[PDB]
Write a structure and sequence with these properties.
This is part of a larger assembly, with one copy of chain A, two copies of chain B and one copy of chain D. Chain A is of the alpha+beta class. Chain A has helices at 16-19, 35-46, 84-87; strands at 25-26, 49-52, 59-62, 67-68. In chain A, strand 2 and strand 3 (59-62) form a beta hairpin. The longest helix of chain A has 12 residues, at 35-46. By secondary structure, chain B is mainly beta. Chain B has one helix spanning 74-78; strands at residues 19-20, 29-37, 46-47, 95-105, 111-113, 127-129. Bound molecules: adenosine-5'-diphosphate (ADP) (2 copies). One adenosine-5'-diphosphate sits between chains D (317-319, 357-363, 511) and C (158, 310-311, 314). It is classed as hydrolase/dna. The entry lists the keywords complex, DNA replication, HYDROLASE-DNA complex.
C-alpha cells in the first residue's frame, strides 16, 4: 500500500506477480536482489497466493504466474567442472521449483 | 465493469464489483430536531428523511422567526407589541437546536477500488467513494470482495 | 467468516454427529481421509489426527496453567510431499495460516507494532501468530529463518503468551497456537549416516523443546517405485481416483465440510479426563525407558544427542486426551492409552537410531 | 426565584429525599467528611498562631427502591441528576456548594467498549473502558471576575458560563469582559478574589487485549472537571462513567456548508476509576478487614512460618526450596536507607538463575509475574527504549520535547522479569550497568539533560554457553558474560539435571496427580508485612556476619571467585528481610544464621 502522486488517495498497488496472472512474467539478473523480493518469488511458486497485512488491510490476492528467468554466472562464464548449484551463487529452494 | 462508466449512467441503478480499501469513522446525522427562537421564544419541530445530498445540505434551519405567519389575532397582537410603534424581529437566523430531545443516525464513507488483475498494465488503478445508510454501517471489514 | 464465526447450530446435525461417533472404526475412517493422494507414511497420517483435536486445558489454582496442543517437525528428504500435506492441513483446519518464511510475503511472522502515521497512535500490526489465535500455524524452512523473531517463537510454544515491551505499550496478549514446523536437512540421508542431530546450525535444545520428531527416509524398491509412479499417473487423469473417491464417499470417509464442522463441535463441547490405573501404567513405562537411557547412556561412553525430559511425559499424557476427545467419552481406558504407547514408541524408534 | 420551578422538580426532590433518608449510611459518610474538614480547620486556625465533596452512591439499592427512578436515570439523565444533587445539598446544608454524585455500578448492559459506542446510545449514561492516550495539559478556567473602581471605592462583579456546565441547555448570552462602567470610570481589575476552576481533556482508545485481529483503532474523548484533574498518567487502564452529550450546531446554520457532518460528540464527567491490569498499574488497593489483620496476628507468632511460606509458592513444582526462600526474600525487599547529605544505599535483592533446559525456569517467572505487584516482562528485545525514553515527541501546540517512559522507569518499586539474558547485546548492558547500582537514568540525547529515578529489581534466567555442560569442564565460563555483570548480581543459582531412580518416582506421581497458604491470602500478608514496620539492626548480629565474612574471604578466596564488599552489603540486606518476615522490630542471631546458610548454598 503506497500513495499515488497523481491522485492523493491511497492505493493497493499489486506487484508484478499480482499483475501478470494467466500470463508470463520476465525476471532477470537474480544475483542482485534483496531477501524481501526473494521471499516473494518463493511465495509465488509455493502456493500461488500473495497475502499482505500492512497497514489496515488483510487480504490474500491470487497470483498464478509463469516465470522465465535469465541467470548470470559467477565471475567467469563457467567456473569449473562443478555442477550448477555449485556454479551459480543461488540457493537450493529456489532451484527446487 | 468499473472501467466503462460514461455520463449516460448518471442517476440510474448500476451495480459493480471491486475491493474495499479502507473505511472511515462513524458520524452522526440528525432525524428529528426541535428548535427555539432565542428572541421570540417560539417552538417548532423538524423531521428529515433522506439524508445523502452531501454538500446540499438536505435542510437548513429557517432564517426568520416564523411567527409572523400566524392565523390568530392575539398572537399577532403580542408579536406586534414586542416594540412600541415598529414591529419586532427575531431576525437574522435566530434558532437554536435543543440537544436534549433529539434523535440521531449513522453514516460511514467507505472507499472502493477495482481488482488489480485487469487491466492496469500501463495505468494506475482508479477509485470511487461510497456512502452508507443506517443499518449498512460497520458490516464490512476492509479487504473483502 | 472468521473472526467471530458461528458456534450454535441446528438439531439434526447433533443427531448425525451422534451417529458418526458410535462406529468402532472411527480411527481408521479418519486415517483414510487425510491422504487420498499421498501414498505411504501412515505414521504421520496418524499424527495429524491427534493434532487437529487439541489437548486438555487446565487452569488449576495457582496462576499457572498448562497447554495443548503438541508440536510436530517433519524433517526429511524432498519427495516426501510434506509441503502438499501442509497445504492439506491449510484446507482442513477451521482457522490456519501458512507462512513460509523468513516472513511472508509482505507480512511479518511475529507480533510487530507499527505506529499509525496519522494520529501518531499505536496499534497491533499483525503477523502470523496473532491472526491465527486458536489453531494451527504451518511453517516451511524452519532452519533457514532469521534469528531476531526467533525468541518469541521459542516463547509462544511454551506459555502461549507473547509479550511486548516497546516504548509506549507493555501489554501481554494470548496466542493458543499449535506450531507444525517442517525443516530441511543438508545432504539428506547422511544425517542418519551421522548422529541424528547435526542439522540446525546453533544447538539441539530446539529438538528437545518439541514433542514428536519425525524423520523420513528413502530406500529404492522396484515395486514401491512402480506403485508410486502408477499411483501418480492414476492421480493425474482423467481423475479416476476422484471417481473412486466418490464411490468411497458413497460408503465411508465422511467429507471435508463434515470434517471441519466435526472438528469444531468435538473441540468446544467436551473435556476429557483419565483414570489412575492408566497413570500407574504410564509411570511403569516411562521409568523403564529412562533407565534404558541410563544404561545406554553409561555404556556408550558419551552423552546423547536427543535427550529425554519430563516434557516427553507431558506429551504422552496429552495424547490420551486427544484420543479421548475423539471418542467423546469423559474417561479413559487401558488399550486407549496402549495405542499411544505404540505410536509414541514408534517415535522413540524414530528417535534413538 | 430563578424561574420559580415546577412541582415536577418538587416531586423528584421529595422522592429522592425519602430514599436518602431511608438507608442511613450516607448520612454517616457526609458526617465523616464534614467533621474531618472541621477538625482540619481547627488545626489550621489554632496551632499556627482538603477532601472533595462527593458521595459514592451504588446502584444496588435503587433497583429495590424504585423501578421508576432506576430506569429513569439510565435513559434520560438530564432530568434526574440535578434534582438529586439539589436535595443532597439541602441535606448537607441542613445538617450543619456543589456536592456531586458518583453512580458506582453495576450498569444495566451499558458495559460497552468504545468500538461499539455510536450512535443510538446517544444522550444516555454509558460506561466505557480503555487505554488512555494522549492526555493534554492542565489549564485554569475563569468563572467570576471582581473589579475595583476608582475613585468611588466600590467593588464589582460579573459571572460567566459555558456549554460544558450542568447538563441541561440554556439560551446563551455572551458578556463582554467589562471596563468603564456607567458613569465613565476606569475599572482596574484584580486577582486573588476572582475564582478559577481547573479543566483537562483526555482521549480513550479501545483495549488491545480486546481488539480485533488487525484493524485501525477508533477513539473518543472525555472532558474532566474540578476534582478529577490528574488521576491517570498516559498508559493506564481506565473505567469512565459519564453522559454521552452531543453539543454544537452541525453546519445547518449557514448555507453552502463545509465540515460535512457536524455534531461532534464527547463525554461529560464523571467518575474516572483506574483499574488493575496484568502489567501496568498498582494493585495495592486490596482491602484489609479487622478479621484479616487478626488472622495475620494469629499466624504471626509461630516458629515454622518461614518453612510454611517456603512451600507456598510451589503448589505444583517439585523440589527447589532454596529458590523459593530467595523469592520471598526478594518480595520483602529489605529496607532503604538514605543518608544525610550524601548518596543513598540500595535496598533490594537481584537474582539470576542459570541451568539446563526443561527445568521450570520459565514457568517460575510467570508465577512471580502473577503474585507480585507491578511486574513487567521483557524478553529478548529490548532496543530501543527499555532503560530509556527515546524522547520521540512531536507536540503539536508548540515546539517542545517531552519524554515517554520505557520499561525501566515505569516499573518503579517493582519487579522486572527478563528472559533470555544472554541474547542481549552489550549496548543495552551499558544501561543495565547504569540501572542496577547507580539507581538513576541520565538522558541527554538532543534534548533536555535530565536525571529521573528508577529503582527496580531484576530477575533473569540465562542459558549456558554450549550444551547443558553445567558441571563438566569448569564453572569458569559456562556462562561467559564477564565480569562486572557477575558481580552486580547477588545470588547465582546453578541448577543441574541429575538422573536417579527415586527422583524419577517423586517427579512421576507429582506430575501424574497434578492433572486432576492460599495465595489471595498470601499477598494480603505481603503488603501488611511491607508497610509496617521497618526494622533496625542490633548488636547481636554484627559478629556473626563479621566472622562469617572474614571466613568467606580467607577460604572462599581459596576455593572460588569473586568476593567483594557487595557480598557483605547483601548479607545485611537478607538479614533485614528475614527480620521483616517474622513481623518483628529488632534483629536476632537467627536471621544471620538463615542468611548465612542461604549464601552457603548459593555460592558453594
Ligand atoms: N507419495 C506421493 N504421492 C503423491 N505425490 C507425491 C508423493 N511424493 C511426492 N509427491 C510430489 O512431490 C511434490 C512435493 O514436493 P515436496 O517434497 O513437498 O517439496 P519440499 O518438501 O522440498 O517443499 C508434489 O508435487 C507431489 O506431487
Ligand atoms: N521440577 C518440576 N516439576 C514440575 N514440572 C517441571 C519441573 N521441571 C520442569 N517442569 C516442566 O517444564 C516446563 C517448563 O520448561 P522451562 O524449563 O520453564 O523452559 P526453558 O528451560 O525453555 O526456560 C513446564 O511445562 C513444566 O511442566
Amino acid at each position: 500500500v503506497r500513495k499515488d502522486p497523481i491522485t492523493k488517495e491511497w492505493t493497493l498497488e499489486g506487484g508484478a506477480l499480482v499483475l501478470a496472472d494467466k500470463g508470463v512474467c520476465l525476471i532477470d539478473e537474480f544475483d542482485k536482489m534483496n531477501d524481501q523480493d526473494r521471499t516473494s518469488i518463493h511465495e509465488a511458486m509455493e502456493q500461488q497466493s500473495i497475502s499482505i497485512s500492512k497497514a489496515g488491510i488483510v487480504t490474500t490476492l491470487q497470483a498464478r504466474c509463469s516465470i522465465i528467468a535469465a541467470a548470470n554466472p559467477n565471475g567467469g562464464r563457467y567456473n569449473s567442472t562443478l555442477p550448477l548449484a555449485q556454479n551459480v551463487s543461488l540457493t537450493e529452494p529456489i532451484l527446487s521449483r | 465493469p468499473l472501467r466503462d462508466l460514461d455520463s449516460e449512467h448518471v442517476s440510474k441503478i448500476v451495480r459493480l464489483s471491486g475491493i474495499i480499501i479502507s473505511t472511515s469513522v462513524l458520524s452522526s446525522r440528525a432525524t428529528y430536531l426541535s428548535i427555539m427562537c432565542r428572541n421570540c421564544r417560539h417552538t417548532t419541530s423538524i423531521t428529515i428523511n433522506n439524508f445523502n445530498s452531501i454538500t446540499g445540505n438536505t435542510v437548513s434551519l429557517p432564517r426568520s422567526c416564523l411567527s409572523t405567519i400566524e392565523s390568530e389575532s392575539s398572537m399577532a397582537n403580542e408579536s406586534n407589541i414586542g416594540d412600541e410603534s415598529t414591529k419586532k424581529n427575531c431576525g437574522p437566523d435566530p434558532y437554536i437546536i435543543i440537544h436534549e430531545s433529539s434523535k440521531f443516525i449513522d453514516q460511514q464513507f467507505l472507499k472502493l477500488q477495482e481488482i488489480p488483475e485487469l487491466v492496469p498494465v500501463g495505468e494506475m488503478p482508479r477509485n470511487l467513494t461510497m456512502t452508507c445508510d443506517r443499518y449498512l454501517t460497520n458490516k464490512v471489514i476492509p479487504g473483502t470482495r | 467468516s472468521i473472526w467471530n464465526s458461528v458456534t450454535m447450530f441446528t438439531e439434526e446435525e447433533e443427531e448425525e454427529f451422534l451417529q458418526l461417533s458410535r462406529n468402532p472404526k472411527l480411527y481408521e475412517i479418519l486415517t483414510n481421509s487425510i491422504a487420498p493422494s499421498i501414498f505411504g507414511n501412515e505414521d504421520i497420517k496418524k499424527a495429524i489426527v491427534c493434532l487437529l483435536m487439541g489437548g486438555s486445558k487446565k487452569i488449576l489454582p495457582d496462576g499457572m496453567r498448562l497447554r495443548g496442543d503438541i508440536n510436530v517437525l517433519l524433517l526429511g528428504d524432498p519427495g516426501t510431499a510434506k509441503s502438499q500435506l501442509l497445504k492439506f492441513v491449510e484446507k482442513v483446519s477451521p482457522i490456519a495460516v501458512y507462512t513460509s518464511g523468513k516472513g511472508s510475503s509482505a507480512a511479518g511472522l511475529t507480533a510487530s507494532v507499527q505506529r499509525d502515521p496519522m494520529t501518531r497512535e499505536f496499534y497491533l500490526e499483525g503477523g502470523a501468530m496473532v491472526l491465527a489465535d486458536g489453531g494451527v500455524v504451518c511453517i516451511d524452512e524452519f532452519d533457514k529463518m532469521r534469528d531476531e523473531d526467533r525468541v518469541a517463537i521459542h516463547e509462544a510454544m511454551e506459555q502461549q503468551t507473547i509479550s511486548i515491551a516497546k516504548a509506549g505499550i507493555t501489554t501481554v496478549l494470548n496466542s493458543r497456537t499449535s506450531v507444525l514446523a517442517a525443516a530441511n536437512p543438508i545432504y539428506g540421508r547422511y544425517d542418519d549416516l551421522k548422529s541424528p542431530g547435526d542439522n540446525i546450525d546453533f544447538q539441539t535444545t530446539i529438538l528437545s523443546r518439541f514433542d514428536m520428531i519425525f524423520i523420513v527416509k528413502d530406500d529404492h524398491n522396484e515395486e514401491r517405485d512402480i506403485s508410486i509412479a502408477n499411483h501418480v499417473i492414476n492421480i493425474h487423469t482423467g481423475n479416476a481416483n476422484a471417481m473412486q473417491n466418490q464411490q468411497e464417499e458413497n460408503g465411508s470417509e465422511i467429507s471435508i465440510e463434515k470434517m471441519k464442522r466435526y472438528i469444531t463441535y468435538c473441540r468446544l463441547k467436551c473435556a476429557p479426563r483419565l483414570s489412575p490405573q492408566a497413570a500407574e501404567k504410564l509411570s511403569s513405562n516411562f521409568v523403564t525407558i529412562r533407565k534404558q537411557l541410563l544404561i545406554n547412556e553409561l555404556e556408550s561412553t558419551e552423552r546423547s544427542s536427543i535427550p529425554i525430559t519430563i516434557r516427553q511425559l507431558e506429551a504422552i499424557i496429552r495424547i490420551t486426551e486427544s484420543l479421548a476427545k475423539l471418542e467423546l467419552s469423559p474417561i479413559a481406558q487401558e488399550r486407549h492409552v496402549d495405542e499411544a504407547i505404540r505410536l509414541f514408541q514408534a517415535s522413540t524408534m524414530d528417535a534413538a537410531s | 426565584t430563578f424561574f420559580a420551578p415546577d412541582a415536577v422538580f418538587g416531586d423528584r426532590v421529595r422522592r429522592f429525599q425519602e430514599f436518602l433518608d431511608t438507608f442511613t449510611s450516607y448520612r454517616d459518610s457526609v458526617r465523616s467528611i464534614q467533621v474531618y474538614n472541621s477538625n482540619n480547620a481547627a488545626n489550621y486556625n489554632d496551632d499556627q498562631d482538603i477532601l472533595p465533596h462527593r458521595i459514592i452512591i451504588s446502584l444496588d439499592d435503587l433497583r429495590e427502591f424504585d423501578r421508576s427512578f432506576w430506569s429513569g436515570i439510565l435513559v434520560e439523565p438530564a432530568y434526574f441528576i440535578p434534582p438529586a444533587e439539589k436535595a443532597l445539598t439541602d441535606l448537607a446544608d441542613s445538617m450543619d456548594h456543589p456536592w456531586k454524585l458518583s453512580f458506582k455500578g453495576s450498569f444495566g448492559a451499558h458495559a460497552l467498549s468504545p468500538r461499539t459506542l455510536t450512535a443510538q446510545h446517544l444522550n444516555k449514561l454509558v460506561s466505557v473502558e480503555g487505554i488512555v492516550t494522549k492526555t493534554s495539559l492542565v489549564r485554569p478556567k475563569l468563572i467570576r471576575s471582581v473589579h475595583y473602581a476608582a475613585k468611588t471605592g466600590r467593588f464589582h462583579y460579573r459571572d460567566y458560563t459555558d456549554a460544558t456546565t450542568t447538563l441541561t441547555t440554556r439560551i446563551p448570552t455572551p458578556a463582554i469582559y467589562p471596563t468603564e462602567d456607567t458613569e465613565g470610570n476606569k475599572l482596574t481589575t484584580e486577582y486573588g478574589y476572582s475564582t478559577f476552576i481547573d479543566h483537562q481533556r483526555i482521549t480513550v482508545q479501545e483495549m488491545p487485549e480486546m481488539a480485533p485481529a488487525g484493524q485501525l483503532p477508533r477513539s473518543i474523548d472525555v472532558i474532566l472537571d474540578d476534582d478529577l484533574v490528574d488521576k491517570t498518567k498516559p498508559g493506564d487502564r481506565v473505567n469512565v462513567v459519564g453522559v454521552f452529550k452531543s453539543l454544537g450546531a452541525g453546519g445547518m446554520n449557514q448555507s453552502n456548508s463545509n465540515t460535512l457532518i457536524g455534531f461532534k460528540t464527547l463525554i461529560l464527567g464523571n467518575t474516572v476509576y483506574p483499574l488493575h491490569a496484568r502489567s501496568t498499574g498498582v494493585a495495592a488497593r486490596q482491602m484489609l478487614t479487622d478479621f484479616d489483620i487478626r488472622n495475620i496476628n494469629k499466624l504471626s507468632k509461630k516458629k515454622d512460618i518461614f518453612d510454611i511460606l517456603s512451600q507456598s509458592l510451589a503448589p505444583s513444582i517439585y523440589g527447589h526450596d532454596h529458590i523459593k526462600k530467595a523469592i520471598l526474600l526478594m518480595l520483602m525487599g529489605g529496607v532503604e536507607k538514605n543518608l544525610e547529605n550524601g548518596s543513598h544505599l540500595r535496598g533490594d535483592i537481584n537474582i539470576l538463575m542459570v541451568g539446563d533446559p526443561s527445568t521450570a525456569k520459565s514457568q517460575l517467572l510467570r508465577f512471580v509475574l502473577n503474585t507480585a505487584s507491578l511486574a513487567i516482562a521483557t524478553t529478548g528485545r529490548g532496543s530501543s527504549g527499555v532503560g530509556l525514553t527515546a524522547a520521540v515527541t512531536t507536540d503539536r501546540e508548540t515546539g517542545e520535547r517531552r519524554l515517554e517512559a520505557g520499561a525501566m522507569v515505569l516499573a518503579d518499586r517493582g519487579v522486572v522479569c527478563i528472559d533470555e539474558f544472554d541474547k542481549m547485546t552489550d549496548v543495552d548492558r551499558v544501561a543495565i550497568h547504569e540501572v542496577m547500582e547507580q539507581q538513576t537514568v541520565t538522558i541527554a540525547k538532543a534534548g533536555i539533560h535530565t536525571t529521573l529515578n528508577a529503582r527496580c529489581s531484576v530477575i533473569a534466567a540465562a542459558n549456558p554457553v554450549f550444551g547443558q555442560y553445567d558441571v563438566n569442564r569448569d564453572p569458569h565460563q559456562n556462562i561467559a558474560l564477564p565480569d562486572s555483570l557477575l558481580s552486580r548480581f547477588d545470588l547465582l543459582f546453578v541448577v543441574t539435571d541429575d538422573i536417579n531412580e527415586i527422583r524419577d518416582r517423586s517427579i512421576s506421581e507429582h506430575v501424574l496427580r497434578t492433572h486432576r497458604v492460599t495465595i489471595p491470602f498470601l499477598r494480603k500478608y505481603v503488603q501488611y508485612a511491607k508497610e509496617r514496620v521497618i526494622p533496625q539492626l542490633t548488636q547481636e548480629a554484627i559478629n556473626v556476619i563479621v566472622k562469617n565474612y572474614t571466613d568467606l574471604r580467607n577460604d572462599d578466596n581459596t576455593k572460588k571467585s569473586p568476593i567483594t564488599a557487595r557480598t557483605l552489603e547483601t548479607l545485611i540486606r537478607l538479614a533485614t528481610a528475614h527480620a521483616k518476615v517474622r513481623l518483628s522490630k529488632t534483629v536476632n542471631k537467627v536471621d544471620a544464621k538463615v542468611a548465612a546458610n542461604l549464601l552457603r548454598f548459593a555460592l558453594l
